[PDB]
RNA sequence: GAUUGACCCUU
RNA sequence: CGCGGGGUGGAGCAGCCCGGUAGCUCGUCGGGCUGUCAACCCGAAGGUCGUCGGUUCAAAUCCGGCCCCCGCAACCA
RNA sequence: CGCGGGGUGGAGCAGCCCGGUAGCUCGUCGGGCUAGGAACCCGAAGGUCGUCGGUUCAAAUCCGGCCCCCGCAACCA
RNA sequence: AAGACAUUGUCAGGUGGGGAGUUUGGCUGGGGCGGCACAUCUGUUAAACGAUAACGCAGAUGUCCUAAGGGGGGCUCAUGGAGAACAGAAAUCUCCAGUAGAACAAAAGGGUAAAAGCCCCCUUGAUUUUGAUUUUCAGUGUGAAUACAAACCAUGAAAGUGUGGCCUAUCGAUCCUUUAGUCCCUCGGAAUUUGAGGCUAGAGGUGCCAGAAAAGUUACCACAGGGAUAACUGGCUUGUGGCAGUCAAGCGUUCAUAGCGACAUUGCUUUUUGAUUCUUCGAUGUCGGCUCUUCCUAUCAUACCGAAGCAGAAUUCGGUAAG
RNA sequence: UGACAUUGUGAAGAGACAUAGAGGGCUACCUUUAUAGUUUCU
RNA sequence: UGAUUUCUGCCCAGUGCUCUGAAUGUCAAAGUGAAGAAAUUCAACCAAGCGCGGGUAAACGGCGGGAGUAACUAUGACUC
RNA sequence: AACUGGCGAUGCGGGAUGAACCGAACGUAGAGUUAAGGUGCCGGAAUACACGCUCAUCAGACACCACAAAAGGUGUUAGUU
RNA sequence: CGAAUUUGGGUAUAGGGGCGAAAGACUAAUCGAACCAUCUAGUAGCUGGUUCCUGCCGAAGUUUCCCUCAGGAUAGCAGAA
């Protein structure tokens, strides 16, 4: 699936509050930091004796993840998030579809 | 010829070792049964040669 | 499983050596003064079987 | 001192 | 678990650590010495180096999204 | 007597998922040295597809009036 | 001898079935193997409201699409006929018919003609906030969808249309992490500031799809049970096995029926084997043989008969007949 | 197996932090000199 | 493995065992260097192991299928 | 698996017997009348009345239900040209 | 049946231990982990039992979810107020 890198869309920036131009990127998960309360609790629980104390998931079934576009407004630099459906192939680079062509 | 409770080699429906009989030097008591830290095995064509 | 025979051989209960018939430890003369500065003459009294 | 192996028919 | 030199023929290969684009056998196309018979020696099919951007003297060689190969059994939402 | 393989030309018979009437099988006027001879083609076929029919794409097989086993009933606890 | 090295203490990384603790799905014409009827969608079963089962039948889903979304405009499709020069049944094809026999991402069913199809122009409503509603439903969730409100936009001349795909499937809790937003609240003796914790919306996933973190073997075995459930008998059924009819195309040199008998078709206790799972799992002792009694007749022999393709002998087909 | 402690006293070589001189037409990994915060093993 | 006798064939690809380190590899704690005001965040590397590479079957174990070759039907010593 | 009615959970009269069929549902008694089913005897109740059919050297005998078929017969009875 | 013989007494080995010319054999009639006491009245969606009378009312084996299928929650059916 091909999504353009720009989009006119509503921005709730309190300065725009209207449809404005947004640059479009793919959202990256972000590194799971230490010192987050959940990781701190997990490390404290895992310290000592007793083995693995919480569950580790194994029965993976999904073959695709939902893609999240990040819309950064070019006017006020407000960011928005929006997810698409599940797709195996996702492309941001615009190479448009051409009808009157051969192959 | 023992049961699996009695030896690493015991058990089976045929009398066979099952896994390799060459045991690591880093093995433990109860594991070190067989050929401990063997560099080679089988019949050797040679003499001691001091 | 179970403790195997070569493991059991280390507790030394029935696997200690049968030392009743033995004639003593076979050791050299102690290295006192004569063995390192001169010599000392002894006599072979008997030659015996050690079990 | 290399690699040259083979060759269906009569006195 | 931000995946390791690597994708070079119908079947196998590294040449490259500052710029010369190209080959070893078989299955082949053809040529003869020995008089002639496999081996014996010489040119050719698959290489546009898997859409792409960079150096306007040289991107198959060095990087950045990807595709059925995976032992990095490497503190694993 | 298993919805399963067969009666595959004179033997021996491999493709069996469309018969210009060869589904494959040494010789015989003749291809270069003809010194007779020594590998390969045809003017010779006892399948006129095991036989009476035509729902007959030219059928005479994929329907039937004859026999058995190449992984043929291992079942009884 | 040896020497600040071994040793010893602590921490850290390997190795470690030698040992420890656990686990090793469900449905199911027993269980296992297979399959998924486990979350779903289309048509039928399904018996003209709705609902409705089976490991019923024919299939499909875990995707795909910046257009294959939204608006406007123009045009009309499949096919058949007469057609050009190579050129042909299947290029290039001008007219005439053409109710859709085309196409609409995919399965099926519905739907669609100055369109929902095919071209062209513009575009990002596949946007924001939160509610209400329909389906499954407990009227819980999830998924999907419907009609508005308040905005901001696209398109068109406009009316209007658009809150993703013509409709019916295409999917995901808590906890944790992570991103976006106010830069809003808190770190509890006042706070530069960093860090952390909250508020609202997404994403990382549980396909056993309301979502455990999980390998075997036991013929050495154990316990709680189960006739809710298999391995005998018995019971219903009789596909299959066995036996018996009806009709006669033919065989029997002639000649359907002495003896047979195809293609069909009607049946008979269960001596087969299945199918089922009603009884029995706080146990009905199991294969065969030996032994012994009895019963059935669908009669091998013996008694007496009928009929022959019965000259005689030997046979064959039948009747009463189980003494 | 590593680190730290037990643990105390002396010896040649290998990395940066040349401020600088040996190389090839708006220039490559590159052998090598004062070694006065530094290195462990042979 | 199981007295004598006679022999004990081929295979180190796999699993295991073993062995130098030739190693753009992976690589903990401690230690070090950038930053930060600091908690902290980033970078190499002498560890062992795992990799790589060699050896080893009287270690565990394994010892197939094709294509072509000749005149009873086969038929393959031979070549891939 | 169907709109249902029942058994389970329910006795009673009948189907000889039977969870489910038919009749009918239940306090303790007494008279009358019935349902379903029956009236030769067992057994309460007509060896009633009326018209036929049937004779079986395996008759038949009343639903659920405890079975019989195709094909036949100058057995006998009744029915078109 | 002259020895890898048989046996008395003493002695050693103790339970995930011993001992085993190996059968999971033997370890006080107990062995694929002995016996004793305790934790412990261990847990059991499973089996069994569950004690007086009369009166009135009176079901369900279905829905949804559940490692859910011999169980439960939920709705339904029922009682009581």
PDB file of C-alpha atoms (C1' of nucleotides) in Angstrom, chain I residues 12-50:
ATOM      1  C1'   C I  12      34.153 -36.950  10.316  1.00  0.00           C
ATOM      2  C1'   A I  13      28.539 -34.306   6.088  1.00  0.00           C
ATOM      3  C1'   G I  14      24.991 -34.628  11.478  1.00  0.00           C
ATOM      4  C1'   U I  15      25.342 -35.117  16.929  1.00  0.00           C
ATOM      5  C1'   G I  16      29.090 -35.521  20.540  1.00  0.00           C
ATOM      6  C1'   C I  17      34.308 -35.507  22.231  1.00  0.00           C
ATOM      7  C1'   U I  18      39.071 -33.226  21.380  1.00  0.00           C
ATOM      8  C1'   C I  19      42.953 -29.413  19.578  1.00  0.00           C
ATOM      9  C1'   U I  20      46.592 -24.540  17.963  1.00  0.00           C
ATOM     10  C1'   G I  21      44.207 -19.526  17.345  1.00  0.00           C
ATOM     11  C1'   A I  22      45.078 -17.990  11.366  1.00  0.00           C
ATOM     12  C1'   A I  23      39.771 -14.672  13.977  1.00  0.00           C
ATOM     13  C1'   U I  24      36.158  -7.024   9.695  1.00  0.00           C
ATOM     14  C1'   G I  25      32.613 -12.305  14.245  1.00  0.00           C
ATOM     15  C1'   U I  26      29.436 -12.504  19.076  1.00  0.00           C
ATOM     16  C1'   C I  27      31.330 -10.955  24.029  1.00  0.00           C
ATOM     17  C1'   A I  28      29.218 -10.106  31.107  1.00  0.00           C
ATOM     18  C1'   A I  29      30.583  -7.621  35.851  1.00  0.00           C
ATOM     19  C1'   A I  30      34.652  -4.511  36.995  1.00  0.00           C
ATOM     20  C1'   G I  31      37.628  -0.986  34.521  1.00  0.00           C
ATOM     21  C1'   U I  32      38.186   2.857  31.259  1.00  0.00           C
ATOM     22  C1'   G I  33      36.702   7.762  27.487  1.00  0.00           C
ATOM     23  C1'   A I  34      33.014  11.419  25.769  1.00  0.00           C
ATOM     24  C1'   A I  35      28.311  14.387  27.412  1.00  0.00           C
ATOM     25  C1'   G I  36      25.647  16.142  31.472  1.00  0.00           C
ATOM     26  C1'   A I  37      24.771  19.647  37.213  1.00  0.00           C
ATOM     27  C1'   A I  38      24.299  14.730  38.521  1.00  0.00           C
ATOM     28  C1'   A I  39      21.400  10.306  38.705  1.00  0.00           C
ATOM     29  C1'   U I  40      22.481   8.579  34.073  1.00  0.00           C
ATOM     30  C1'   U I  41      23.147   7.961  28.143  1.00  0.00           C
ATOM     31  C1'   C I  42      26.524   6.648  24.487  1.00  0.00           C
ATOM     32  C1'   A I  43      32.109   3.791  22.419  1.00  0.00           C
ATOM     33  C1'   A I  44      36.921  -0.246  21.947  1.00  0.00           C
ATOM     34  C1'   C I  45      39.221  -4.159  24.016  1.00  0.00           C
ATOM     35  C1'   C I  46      43.839  -8.860  26.499  1.00  0.00           C
ATOM     36  C1'   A I  47      37.802 -13.402  29.636  1.00  0.00           C
ATOM     37  C1'   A I  48      36.134 -18.156  28.924  1.00  0.00           C
ATOM     38  C1'   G I  49      32.439 -20.120  25.879  1.00  0.00           C
ATOM     39  C1'   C I  50      29.875 -20.043  21.193  1.00  0.00           C
TER      40        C I  50
END
